[PDB]
Amino acid sequence: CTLKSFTVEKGIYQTSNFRVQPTESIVRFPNITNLCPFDEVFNATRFAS
Amino acid sequence: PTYGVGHQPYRVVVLSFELLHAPATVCGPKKSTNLVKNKCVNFNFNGLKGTGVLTESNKKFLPFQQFGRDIADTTDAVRDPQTLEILDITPCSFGGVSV
Amino acid sequence: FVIRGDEVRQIAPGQTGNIADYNYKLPDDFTGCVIAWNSNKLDSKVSGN
Amino acid sequence: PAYTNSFTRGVYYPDKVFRSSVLHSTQDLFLPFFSNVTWFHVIFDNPVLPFNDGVYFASIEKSNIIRGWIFGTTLDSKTQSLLIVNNATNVVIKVCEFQFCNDPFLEFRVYSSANNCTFEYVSQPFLMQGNFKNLREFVFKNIDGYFKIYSKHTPIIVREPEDLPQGFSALEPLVDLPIGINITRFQTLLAAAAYYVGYLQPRTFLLKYNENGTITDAVDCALDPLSETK
Amino acid sequence: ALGKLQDVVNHNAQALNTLVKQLSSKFGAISSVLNDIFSRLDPPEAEVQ
Amino acid sequence: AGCLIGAEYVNNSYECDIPIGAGICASYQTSQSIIAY
């Protein structure tokens, strides 16, 4: 296939490239610490008018 | 309380979004998976997308250092966001076959 | 199909939005013509259609 | 005012990429080697110096008098500003629109009438032997929106009277404040002082990293023909 | 003394240090990293860059 | 040079027919099988 013919000659030929494909995926992004203060407008003690 | 549905108080809030011309500071939560050591997989450590094996390293990084490139400007090491561990990004095993 | 006015620009081959990603998406190699015209004369009615 | 010579100080890390024993050229707003920088002796000198594409702050003192950095374009009653303040507790970084004063000094007497603020970054780690005074370099810059602050602390013996020492000290990034003000002017404040200011300009530098990942020296590329040859 | 042999070694080294250097040069595009191009533009213009 | 999978390394030395690399050559000699040497 790499050399278009049906009868190849004697010698060494570079056909293609070997390459292992990844198996899984990893997505890491920093620890979530600074959450928005949404508990102050949903669980407030005195709402507005 | 004698009043039925429609006359009862309903606390209404509106999370109005602006999306102005400024550096975005309010984002959403990002999911974080596990970390395999000896396995060629895909990595996305804080924007740094690529493929390869994520093994340990002995390169002493500085506190403000996050990424690391090689002589040929290629990402060779990275610091994990959650744990302050400096890994070693080595590409997946490749090569060239000859018949 | 019938869409709104500001959404006609999403019928081009390759675009984001809501109708170009979940309703009707065209391939990047679309070799054709898209024809649209304002139809606010028989597809509209009081209190919205 | 006065004028001194900044021999080789004013070099910071352009990025946060670890490099080991290589030479990476970079085009960023650095300080030109062997340039005339302003010198003010506040041992009273608090002028309103313009912030033009970066600045290089340096304080050679033996106490905590020089502490504070006011920014902003029209910092009277109209546009937002920035107050990098530190009083014995922590940093009081707070970008806020408020009424200023003619002569600022340090209680918190710099402010006059606070208004609706936009962001605050109060952080516990503050920015800051004997006769050895403390050299405190500071580089401020705002490229797209992020106000970057670099700093480095090292002791210094005063052999020559009130002069910047000769040596290469790498400047590490401290904060990356996501601000949105159009900073165009600068004003210092206090509470043996040394007010050193140096303006930045687009330059190319060849930074040699060590095996531990630290810059040891640099080349100005515009000082002498030998720099261009290197 | 062995300068003629070091010549072909340095010439074959500077030729390999140039190909790895031109991989970061922006040949009239938004960036050099291919992952960045496919993450900040639309498909019809992604193939353009 | 790599991992040659498909031939056997014979201790006998012959003339180089198919150059592999690093002084290793291959030939199709006699049962007919590809040998390395």
Swiss-Prot record, chain F:
Superkingdom of this protein's organism: Viruses
Effect the entry attributes to changing residue 27 to A: No effect on O-glycosylation by host GALNT1
Cystine crosslinks: 16-25
Result, substituting residue 30 to A: Partial loss of O-glycosylation by host GALNT1
Sites carrying sugar chains: 11, 30
Function of the molecule: Attaches the virion to the cell membrane by interacting with host receptor, initiating the infection. The major receptor is host ACE2. When S2/S2' has been cleaved, binding to the receptor triggers direct fusion at the cell membrane. When S2/S2' has not been cleaved, binding to the receptor results in internalization of the virus by endocytosis using host TFRC and GRM2 and leading to fusion of the virion membrane with the host endosomal membrane. Alternatively, may use NRP1/NRP2 and integrin as entry receptors.
Quaternary structure, from the entry: Binds to host ACE2. RBD also interacts with the N-linked glycan on 'Asn-90' of ACE2. Cleavage of S generates a polybasic C-terminal sequence on S1 that binds to host Neuropilin-1 (NRP1) and Neuropilin-2 (NRP2) receptors. Interacts with host integrin alpha-5/beta-1 (ITGA5:ITGB1) and with ACE2 in complex with integrin alpha-5/beta-1 (ITGA5:ITGB1). May interact via cytoplasmic c-terminus with M protein. May interact (via N-terminus) with host bilirubin and biliverdin, thereby preventing antibody binding to the SARS-CoV-2 spike NTD via an allosteric mechanism.
Protein name (database record): Spike protein S1
Lineage of the species this protein comes from: Viruses, Riboviria, Orthornavirae, Pisuviricota, Pisoniviricetes
Residues of the full protein shown: 647 to 695 of 1273
